[PDB]
Amino acid sequence: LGGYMLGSAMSRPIIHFGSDYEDRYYRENMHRYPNQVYYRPMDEYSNQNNFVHDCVNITIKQHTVTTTTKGENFTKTDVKMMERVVEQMCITQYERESQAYYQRGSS
Structure with a gap:
């Protein structure tokens, strides 16, 4: 954080870890999972x-600091899913900046 930008919530990406156990775990903890990333x-x-x-x-290093002190708790399992979910969220923003970079032209 500092020299990066923040993208508001969009949509919590769907990830597949182990099986229905983890799938339902994350799905039920989406509300506690961050939906914003830093690009x-x-x-x-x-x-x-x-x-x-x-x-x-x-993104993870940022939320683990503030979000965990704002009223949450990200453990080992939390950062695991966060890594996968944030990765997808980063791609979404990639196209957001790519649309402005491609339209920017040659400058």
């Missing part, structure tokens, strides 16, 4: 891999 402007060699990668670590 940064596109740099040299515009790629979705680097964009989402850097977005995942910051």
Whole structure:
């Protein structure tokens, strides 16, 4: 956080971990799971891999600090699903910035 941007809630991505046990666990904890991510402007060699990668670590590292002190509790299992769910959320924002970068033209 600091030199990044924040994207408001959109839609909690659907992830598949082990089986129905974990599936229903996360699905029932979506309300306690963050739906916002932190994305940064596109740099040299515009790629979705680097964009989402850097977005995942910051998003989880950010919520675990404030959200866990705002009225939540992210444990080992919480960060696990968060990693997968945030990764998808980062891709969504990737297209959001890619639409403005592609329309920006050659500047």
